[PDB]
Amino acid sequence: SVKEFLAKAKEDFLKKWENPAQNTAHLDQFERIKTLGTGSFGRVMLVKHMETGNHYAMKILDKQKVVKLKQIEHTLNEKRILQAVNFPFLVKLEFSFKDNSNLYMVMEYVPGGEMFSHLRRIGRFSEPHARFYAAQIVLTFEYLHSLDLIYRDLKPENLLIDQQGYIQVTDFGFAKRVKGRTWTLCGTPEYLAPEIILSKGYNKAVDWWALGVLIYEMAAGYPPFFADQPIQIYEKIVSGKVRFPSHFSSDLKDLLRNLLQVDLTKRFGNLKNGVNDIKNHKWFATTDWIAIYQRKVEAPFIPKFKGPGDTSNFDDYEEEEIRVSINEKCGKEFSEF
C-alpha cells in the first residue's frame, strides 16, 4: 500500500530527524567552479569533490546575512529536514558543514537547469508535458505532507530538470515540520494562497494551492495572478477570480478551479479523501503513478548534456570570493547546524 510505503518512509525520516548528521565535510575538500544561482543570504555554486571527482551544488549561506534577514530558524529547518528526507524527486544532501563565516550544504548537482529557464524560453508546456511534471510534485507533496512537513515555496525557479528529464525539488529554505497551524508570511508573491496573504493560520493546503499556480503557469506560460508589483498580485489572488486560456482543456480547468479554491473546505488536497481527489481527477487519468514514481515514464524533454561539470543549461552570474573570517560569527545561533 502507499499508506504502508509512507509509514515505513516516516520511520526512516524520524531516525534522521531526531539525530541529524552534522559536520560531514570541509570546504577545502571541494574545488569551486561556477555560480549556478543567487539569493538574499547567499549563493549556490558548482563544485568538484577532489577525492571522488564528483560534481555537486554547494549552497553557501552567510551566517551574518541569515541573522539580519531573521532566517536563523528557517535555515536550521532547511538543513535538518533535507538531511532526513529521501524521495526520488527530492535533491539529496550529500554533506553539510560550517566555518567561521558561512554554512554549507552540498547537494547532488542537477545539470539540466531550472524548469523556469526552459519554461520561459519555450513559452509554455503542452498539457501532457505539464502533467508529467505535476505528477512528480503530487507524489512529492504526498510524501512531504505525510512527514508533517509543509514545503511553502513551490515555483519553477527551484524545480531542476535532471539528465533523465525528471524533476528535482531543490531548496527547503521555508520548509517546516509542523502539526496543525503556522503563521509565517513566506513564499513567492505569485504562489501565495489567500490564507497566507490574509494573515490567518495556515496548513499544508497552501502547497496544493501552489500546485494549482504551478500547473497553470506551466500550461499557460504565465501565472494566473500577475502584475508589476506584489501588492497588485495579492489583490488579484484574494479576489481569486481566475481566467483560463481558451486552449486549456476542460479537465485542466476543472482541476485548477479545485486547486485554486479560496474555500479550504473545498480545496483539493484538503478534503476528507486527501491527495486522492487529485490523483483520481480526470486530468490525471492517463498518469501511471507507479511508473512516474519508478521513473519508467519517458520524459517529454531531455536536457542537453555536453559533459560532466557542464553549466550550459544555467545562466551566468557575477562571481564573488568566498571569504572566511578569522573570527567565528554567530556561533550560538547555528550551534546545531
Binding site: 513559452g123 525557479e157 529554505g173 509565517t184 508570511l185 513567492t188 486560456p245
Partner: peptide, 20 residues
C-alpha cells in the same frame, strides 16, 4: 493578449522569495 501583457511586465525574470 494576456501573454503580451505578461512579457511586457516586470516579473518575467526570476522571482525572489518574500518574508515578513
Amino acid at each position: 493578449t494576456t501573454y503580451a501583457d505578461f512579457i511586457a511586465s516586470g516579473r518575467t525574470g526570476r522571482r525572489n522569495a518574500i518574508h515578513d
